[PDB]
């Protein structure tokens, strides 16, 4: 049946962090061996199940919630981490059982004037339960109430952007991760 990964990896438009699209894939035959080829330096960090061992094994459902974050935060989306993405944007349950594909994508993610179509929520009152997604744009009173539906001393607007340009360091270079989080699907 040839499970569709041609979408989640090769789709033109690239999801941002907070709006991470958890594309559920199922009822089809996949091949994880297809993936080990692109990123000359992938990331495939398989938490839970061995990358090669995975092919002849399977579970009920799969979620490849791809998006884009800064290269220096590729290390950040790993279970048990406690960073900015981990606390407020995306997290992995401690008993994570998936594979975290992550590769450098300099092209199509770097305009000479900068691709600012990506944002990241740098502020939140409380941390995230595993796999929470929050599109809430409401203004973050990191500091006092008053009414807060617009302000600007500091209330703060919890969803900044990034800056992506080829001259940046590799850490600043944007990377697209594809976190897979796992009996109708296996090959």
């Amino acid at each position, epitope marked *: 049946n040839l499970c569709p990964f041609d979408e989640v990896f090769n789709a033109t438009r690239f999801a941002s962090v907070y709006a991470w699209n958890r594309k559920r894939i199922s009822n089809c035959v996949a091949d994880y061996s297809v993936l080990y080829n692109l990123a000359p330096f992938f990331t495939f*960090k*398989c938490y839970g199940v061995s990358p090669t061992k995975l092919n002849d094994l399977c579970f009920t459902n799969v979620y490849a919630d791809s998006f884009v974050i800064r290269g220096d935060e590729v290390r950040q989306i790993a279970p048990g981490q406690t960073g900015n993405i981990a606390d407020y944007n995306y997290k992995l349950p401690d008993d994570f059982t998936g594979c975290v594909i992550a590769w450098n994508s300099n092209k199509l993610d770097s305009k000479v004037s900068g691709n600012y179509n990506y944002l990241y929520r740098l502020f939140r009152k409380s941390n995230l339960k595993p796999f929470e997604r929050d599109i809430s744009t409401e203004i973050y009173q990191a500091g006092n109430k008053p009414c807060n539906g617009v302000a600007g001393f500091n209330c703060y607007f919890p969803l900044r952007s990034y800056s992506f340009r080829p001259t940046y*360091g590799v850490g600043h270079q944007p990377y697209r991760v594809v976190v897979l989080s796992f009996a109708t699907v296996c090959g």
Partner: antibody
Amino acid sequence: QVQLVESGGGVVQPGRSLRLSCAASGFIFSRYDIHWVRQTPGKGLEWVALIRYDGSDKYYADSVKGRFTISRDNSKNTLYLQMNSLRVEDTAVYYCAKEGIQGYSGYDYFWTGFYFDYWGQGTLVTV
Amino acid sequence: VVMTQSPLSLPVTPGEPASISCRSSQSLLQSNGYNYLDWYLQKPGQSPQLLIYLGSNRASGVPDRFSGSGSGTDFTLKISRVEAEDVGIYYCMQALQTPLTFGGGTKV
């Protein structure tokens, strides 16, 4: 709440062996590594050996590389290290140290390196 | 690899900042732009605790005054505000490959 408590060490005799066990809990002690590091007094800490979170594969220090034996013990969240054939210059407290990246089985570009986030309390062993 | 710290003793009267340096036999900065020395302290009569990791970004639960600078081979720990809680020997593990030649060790 990450906890590495260890016991088993003590006064021993040159030429024989001993069994060190570093019980763990608080975290899922089936996910990520534990290292061993020893410091003999009057000398800086010397790294001993590690093990990848299920016993996948082992490395030992160039000063040992084989007379030391480490063996994980899952299903009860305990670690076992077995020394063999101690020498004179091995009297040293042995620290079992948890390293704070929850181990992956793949190949990352970004490695984050070994770093022993939470440690034990040591077991003075003397030859 | 072998690590050599400096100074293995920096008795620093309280307040003013103290710097501790380590040398590397090879450039630890790997092609991904990460440095790998790790500063480990240990107060007298206690287990060592993580103080910095990967050279730059410290472990959660460590004050801001334990900033550590990075290079290709000459890394440095900055203790902006030294007081009683900061006393204890430090170390610089190189975290690049087995074996981890755990550094010499300074003093406070």
